[PDB]
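Escalated from tier 1: ammonium ion holo job.
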Amino acid sequence: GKVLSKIFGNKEMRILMLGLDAAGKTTILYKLKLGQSVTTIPTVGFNVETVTYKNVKFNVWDVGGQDKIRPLWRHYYTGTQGLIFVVDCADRDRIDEARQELHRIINDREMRDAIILIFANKQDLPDAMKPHEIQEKLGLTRIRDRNWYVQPSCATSGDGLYEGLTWLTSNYK
Ligand SMILES: Nc1nc2c(ncn2[C@@H]2O[C@H](COP(=O)(O)OP(=O)(O)O)[C@@H](O)[C@H]2O)c(=O)[nH]1
Ligand SMILES: [N+]
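Tier 2 regenerated the structure:
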């Protein structure tokens, strides 16, 4: 509200918020009070949520699906200026799949200039990977071509969310 109003203002931005299922995307939106959305289903089993806030638009969907739906993802790339990629830091077994999904998205032709915010989510859970190991595990340390940042978060209690969004808004072009 007053916080979102100060961070976003009347700024115009097109943002994707992606991550594997269970990473914490729905919780992040509920915590920011972005309770309403519009669902589109471009093919059975592929659900997209779109949230508008003033001159901001988010598109949100789970990655990690069937390979055959990957062509449909690029319908959402044109004009996208910010990618928010949400990672469950307690799920050590799927970090390599999250790495491969991320690099698949940012290597698309139409995604060459989006900056990358990582939410390193679920920092409160037993033996969650820390921001600095997430940097290495997601292969970010080797990305020299663009600006990126890893924000530790606990989406259930709201920690790190406003800090992450302040990075994104201050760095987007
Ligand atoms: N402990 C903990 N659980 C979280 C956190 N964020 C999300 N969750 C839980 O993880 C599950 C998946 O979250 P959800 O928002 O549905 O993920 P989505 O599938 O990406 O939308 C739910 O049970 C959330 O409450 C967090 O930071 N800490
Ligand atoms: N979700």
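The first helix runs from residue 2 to 8.
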